Write a protein that binds this ligand. Structure first.
Ligand SMILES: [Mg+2]
Ligand SMILES: [Mg+2]
Ligand SMILES: [Mg+2]
Ligand SMILES: [Mg+2]
Ligand SMILES: [Mg+2]
Ligand SMILES: [Mg+2]
Ligand SMILES: [Mg+2]
Ligand SMILES: [Mg+2]
Ligand SMILES: [Mg+2]
Ligand SMILES: [Mg+2]
Ligand SMILES: [Mg+2]
Ligand SMILES: [Mg+2]
Ligand SMILES: [Mg+2]
Ligand SMILES: [Mg+2]
Ligand SMILES: [Mg+2]
Ligand SMILES: [Mg+2]
Ligand SMILES: [Mg+2]
Ligand SMILES: [Mg+2]
Ligand SMILES: [Mg+2]
Ligand SMILES: [Mg+2]
Ligand SMILES: [Mg+2]
Ligand SMILES: [Mg+2]
Ligand SMILES: [Mg+2]
Ligand SMILES: [Mg+2]
Ligand SMILES: [Mg+2]
Ligand SMILES: [Mg+2]
Ligand SMILES: [Mg+2]
Ligand SMILES: [Mg+2]
Ligand SMILES: [Mg+2]
Ligand SMILES: [Mg+2]
Ligand SMILES: [Mg+2]
Ligand SMILES: [Mg+2]
Ligand SMILES: [Mg+2]
Ligand SMILES: [Mg+2]
Ligand SMILES: [Mg+2]
Ligand SMILES: [Mg+2]
Ligand SMILES: [Mg+2]
Ligand SMILES: [Mg+2]
Ligand SMILES: [Mg+2]
Ligand SMILES: [Mg+2]
Ligand SMILES: [Mg+2]
Ligand SMILES: [Mg+2]
Ligand SMILES: [Mg+2]
Ligand SMILES: [Mg+2]
Ligand SMILES: [Mg+2]
Ligand SMILES: [Mg+2]
Ligand SMILES: [Mg+2]
Ligand SMILES: [Mg+2]
Ligand SMILES: [Mg+2]
Ligand SMILES: [Mg+2]
Ligand SMILES: [Mg+2]
Ligand SMILES: [Mg+2]
Lengths: 160, 130, 122, 67, 200
RNA sequence: CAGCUUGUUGGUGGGGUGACGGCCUACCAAGGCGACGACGGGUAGCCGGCCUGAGAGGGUGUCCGGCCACACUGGGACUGA
RNA sequence: AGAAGCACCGGCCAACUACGUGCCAGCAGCCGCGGUAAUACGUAGGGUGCGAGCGUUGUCCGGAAUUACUGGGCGUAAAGAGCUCGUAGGUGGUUUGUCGCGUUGUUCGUGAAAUCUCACGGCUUAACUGUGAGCGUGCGGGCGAUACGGGCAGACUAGAGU
RNA sequence: CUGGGCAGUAACUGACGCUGAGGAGCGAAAGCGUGGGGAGCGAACAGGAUUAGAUACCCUGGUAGUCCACGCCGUAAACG
RNA sequence: UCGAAGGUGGGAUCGGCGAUUGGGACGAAGUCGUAACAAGGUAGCCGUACCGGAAGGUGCGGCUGGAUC
């Protein structure tokens, strides 16, 4: 009952005396589609096995995403090894304006209204890691107001 | 040694990252006003002014949660001495989409974005805190 | 670097290179097509490419590629030349337009029939 | 310069693109029917009709004469 | 121009039936061609493409005109998908179809094309005419008593009438209370994929 | 492209103009511009705008509208508000 | 009843098989495809996109955060001058008063019309056209503010020097 | 004969600071000019050996140079 | 008097061609060696000087982006 997206599958190799031993990696995104998403790498000698391992890794590594009604609360910039991803909230009309990896992550997390731009490296793994880093950096109004005081010193027009 | 306000922000940021409970730093009226703004916005606990060997010393105690988490996420100087930055009441900056605070120096004193838009005055954008 | 350094010395874009050199602003160009011959491509292709030396009305001598299979070109003969690279011939950057002044269309061609020049059927 | 004074004017204006405040200086030429003004000598000027090929300013008053 | 081609092929490619009626189903699976039985790769571009295809061939709109409808929708305040649906729904031939005066969409289009209607006593024959709030639609009084129009005179009970337009007695006339809301009126498609298609 | 300038920079008396003015002339003084690029070379009608772009920017000046310049090439005046 | 074509179908990028050919003929934006079972060459069938149009060439922007103000860098990937002194320039510690140049508030004038955006109105619809409000980032005049920058007049010793 | 550094004192001045386009100065070794000096080493050069060849490596010699005075040159993986 | 066009003269500057000649790049399955990459068979690179068909060698100083107990 989850949403699973396999993002990138590539064939890696290792050289031995005989020749090249091939294997497969399959980066997988898994999320409940509502507010919670996980990422798992996964790797094996066969594509379905790698996909499976990615699925269990992601499902074990679920984490929670702060939404404010179908979009993220405030703009953020996430930083992976060398991938840079910029996310900004948008009005309810907009869709998900994102690239491949970022779109996978956001649509599995259950985000409907986002402008996502990748500025650093183009590797899919690092783009995914930067996106999850930005989602970690995200904040909620309720604990920012808990940290500061008098939880009205913000702007909460919609609510619901 | 230039830009003591950036020096103040850097000291506070480094201590906050190092999990320190308080900082000391030379006291000026501008720093005292910024500290007052930060306390009013709830990013620090109370502050005070001592008397050091020469001049006065400003001491700030930093606020942490029940667990060991920082109430201050970021800090960045905006109007640097190499490039001053000003804004009008129409287009005052917005920090974290409004979940942060930007310090504005106006003819009526230091103010935040909300307090400055409610008064309809602009000025120099000193720093973002959020 | 250093807003003051930028004020003293601004940013300068990169230098590109003109590609339409023989055409010098025109989408096509007429030529006289002297000394038609054949050429062998770069290393891993080993084919026999059909080309021509075209003296354009912009007073420049360039080499063009003749697309399609089979042509009616010869010595002095007026052709219409357009831009286009071949990527295996060393320095050919122009193509003969098929279906123009002297280059009749490709015979028996049935697919795409507009490149290479060909009327549908009548 | 025989009844003519040369005055240097400085003005500051924001850079069109980078936003920095740039300081630049001018050099206008002003008129002295009674030539009394020396080097230094912050002065006030008022622009007038073309009194010469290059003169467009007239000296008003020498305020805070040179040290 | 117009498509004027087999509608069943066009429904079989998009895996959704768009016609209903007497020719509702072809009574066979969906291999839309010779290789139509292949289990093929499913890209992200394909979903957006086929959703916009469904949107276009539900209404018989051409790509160049749908493109303009897109700028209108995105440029309108509010949202985007519901505005696109509202614009595509306010078309006069669509109104004729939804007011239970048509067996299909194509024949409603032909009745509008051949000028069998007047709106404010104005003879109109453009299918892409946009109806508005407080518009009355009247059939040309010298065009009634004709077989394909009177065959819909008695068959006005089966297909429901939406809640923004209204039909009246034997003088078949249409009144528009307000502009529709297609998102709550009969969406066989998701409007959130057209928006994503028109961003790449 | 690193030195450019001698009616050149300024003054006085005259002349001239619809009008201030080296605009012109006689005399006098020795200045004026320049690394914030003078002098030189290349290219170019300028703008409201047009195309693109999330924006900032980039490219452009064609229809339409405003201003300028010119009328085979170069020079000159006359008539007249 | 008088009236449909053009491009493509290896990946990007929607769209696949057969026959013929056999490093030849040829294709190609990139990297590549063709040396005897070619979805990449030519034809056929089928499909996809668009449609009175569809493709190619040429040019500009985009993608390009590859000139980076917004918005990049310099140990080893391109990138710290061999080192210092110093001219113009840029930048500047704490504190008092004043000015109001910068900055900021408000008002008046101007920013032609058309074009652009938002709402209507009129051509059967639309393109097109008319009206109203925006926009016109600016500049000039008046009248306020003095936190910060700056000027002017002082003070201090923490930087610097003796 | 002469330059700089550090610590202590807090006696003195009272922001006199920082950086620095151009510019100027200094700047290993090799090299250049004029004069001197020349033990050892040692480019070039010669012979021997090795080698298919050996314009090299190895061996025996060996000039400029290396040194000094006074100038020039202004470059180094002038590197953390 | 001023004055266009023209004439005379010495320069400046921007291009074209030019016997012959210098290097550069790309070409096939040509000839000669084997300089570098392993201690690449004499560690390699940097500056400079002389020499040599050619890669290069040697001297002086430097570096490790080399080794040694
Ligand atoms: Mg990159
Ligand atoms: Mg006079
Ligand atoms: Mg004279
Ligand atoms: Mg005179
Ligand atoms: Mg011209
Ligand atoms: Mg951009
Ligand atoms: Mg003329
Ligand atoms: Mg003529
Ligand atoms: Mg003439
Ligand atoms: Mg008259
Ligand atoms: Mg007259
Ligand atoms: Mg595809
Ligand atoms: Mg075959
Ligand atoms: Mg083919
Ligand atoms: Mg049309
Ligand atoms: Mg481009
Ligand atoms: Mg750019
Ligand atoms: Mg920058
Ligand atoms: Mg870079
Ligand atoms: Mg640095
Ligand atoms: Mg390297
Ligand atoms: Mg490097
Ligand atoms: Mg250094
Ligand atoms: Mg100075
Ligand atoms: Mg200074
Ligand atoms: Mg200053
Ligand atoms: Mg200060
Ligand atoms: Mg206007
Ligand atoms: Mg109307
Ligand atoms: Mg004003
Ligand atoms: Mg001291
Ligand atoms: Mg004292
Ligand atoms: Mg210095
Ligand atoms: Mg220098
Ligand atoms: Mg020296
Ligand atoms: Mg020496
Ligand atoms: Mg000597
Ligand atoms: Mg010599
Ligand atoms: Mg000697
Ligand atoms: Mg010896
Ligand atoms: Mg020897
Ligand atoms: Mg020998
Ligand atoms: Mg060097
Ligand atoms: Mg050294
Ligand atoms: Mg020659
Ligand atoms: Mg060697
Ligand atoms: Mg070797
Ligand atoms: Mg050897
Ligand atoms: Mg060796
Ligand atoms: Mg030798
Ligand atoms: Mg050497
Ligand atoms: Mg050595």
């Amino acid at each position: 009952n989850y949403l699973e997206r396999v993002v990138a599958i590539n064939r890696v190799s290792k050289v031995v005396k005989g020749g090249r031993r091939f294997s497969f990696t399959a980066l997988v995104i898994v999320g409940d589609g509502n507010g919670m998403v996980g990422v798992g790498y996964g790797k094996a000698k066969e594509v379905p096995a790698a996909i499976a391992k990615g699925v269990e890794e992601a499902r074990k590594s679920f984490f929670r995403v702060p939404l404010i009604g179908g979009t993220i609360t405030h703009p953020v910039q996430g930083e992976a090894a060398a991938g840079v991803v910029l996310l900004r909230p948008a009005s309810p009309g907009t869709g998900v304006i994102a690239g491949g990896a970022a779109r996978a992550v956001l649509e599995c997390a259950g985000v409907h209204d986002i402008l996502a731009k990748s500025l650093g490296s183009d590797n899919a793994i690092n783009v995914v890691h930067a996106t999850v880093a930005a989602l970690k950096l995200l904040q909620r109004p309720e604990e920012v107001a808990a940290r500061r005081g008098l939880p009205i010193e913000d702007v909460a027009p919609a609510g619901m | 040694m230039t830009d003591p306000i950036a020096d103040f922000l850097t000291r506070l940021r480094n201590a906050n990252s190092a999990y320190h409970d308080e900082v000391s730093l030379p006291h000026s009226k501008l720093k005292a006003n910024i500290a007052q703004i930060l306390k009013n916005e709830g990013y620090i606990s109370d502050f005070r002014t001592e008397d050091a060997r020469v001049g006065k010393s400003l001491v700030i105690q930093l606020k942490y949660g029940p667990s060991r988490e920082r109430s201050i996420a970021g800090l960045r100087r905006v109007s640097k001495p190499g490039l001053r930055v000003y804004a009008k009441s129409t287009n005052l900056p917005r920090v974290l989409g409004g979940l942060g605070v930007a310090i504005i120096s106006t003819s009526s004193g230091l103010l935040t974005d909300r307090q400055a838009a409610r008064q309809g005055v602009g000025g120099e954008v000193l720093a973002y805190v959020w | 670097p250093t807003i003051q350094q930028l004020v003293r010395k601004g940013r300068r874009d990169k230098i590109s290179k003109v590609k339409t050199a023989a055409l010098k602003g025109s989408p096509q160009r007429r030529g006289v097509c002297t000394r038609v011959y054949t050429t062998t491509p770069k290393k891993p292709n080993s084919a026999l490419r059909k080309v021509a030396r075209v003296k354009l009305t912009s007073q420049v001598e360039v080499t063009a590629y003749i697309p399609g299979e089979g042509h009616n070109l010869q010595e002095h003969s007026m052709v219409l030349v357009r831009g286009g690279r071949v990527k295996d011939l060393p320095g050919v950057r122009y193509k003969i337009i098929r279906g123009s002044l002297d280059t009749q269309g490709v015979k028996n061609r049935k697919q795409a029939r507009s490149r290479y020049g060909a009327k549908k059927e009548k | 310069m025989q009844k003519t004074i040369v005055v240097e004017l400085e003005d500051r204006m924001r850079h069109p693109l980078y936003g920095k405040i740039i300081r630049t200086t001018k050099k206008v030429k002003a008129h002295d029917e009674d030539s009394v003004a020396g080097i230094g000598d912050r002065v006030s000027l008022m622009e007038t009709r073309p009194l010469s090929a290059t003169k467009r300013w007239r000296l008003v008053e020498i305020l805070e004469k040179a040290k | 121009a117009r498509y004027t081609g087999p509608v069943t092929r066009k429904s079989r490619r998009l895996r959704t039936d768009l016609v209903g009626g007497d020719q509702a189903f072809e009574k066979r699976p969906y291999p839309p061609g010779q290789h139509g039985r292949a289990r093929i790769k499913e890209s992200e571009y394909l979903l957006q493409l086929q959703e916009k295809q469904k949107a276009r061939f539900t209404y018989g709109v051409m790509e160049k005109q749908f493109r303009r409808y897109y700028e209108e929708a995105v440029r309108q305040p509010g949202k985007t998908g519901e505005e696109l649906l509202k614009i595509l729904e306010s078309r006069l031939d669509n109104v004729i179809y939804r007011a239970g005066l048509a067996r299909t969409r194509r024949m409603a289009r032909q009745l509008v094309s051949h000028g069998h209607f007047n709106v404010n006593g104005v003879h109109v024959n453009v299918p892409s005419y946009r109806v508005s709030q407080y518009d009355i639609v009247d059939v040309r009084d010298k065009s009634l008593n004709t077989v394909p129009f009177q065959i819909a005179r008695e068959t006005a009970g089966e297909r429901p009438i939406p809640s923004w337009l209204q039909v009246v007695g034997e003088r078949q006339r249409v009144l528009i209370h307000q502009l529709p809301e297609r998102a709550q009126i009969d969406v066989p498609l998701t409007e959130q994929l057209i928006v994503e298609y028109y961003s790449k």
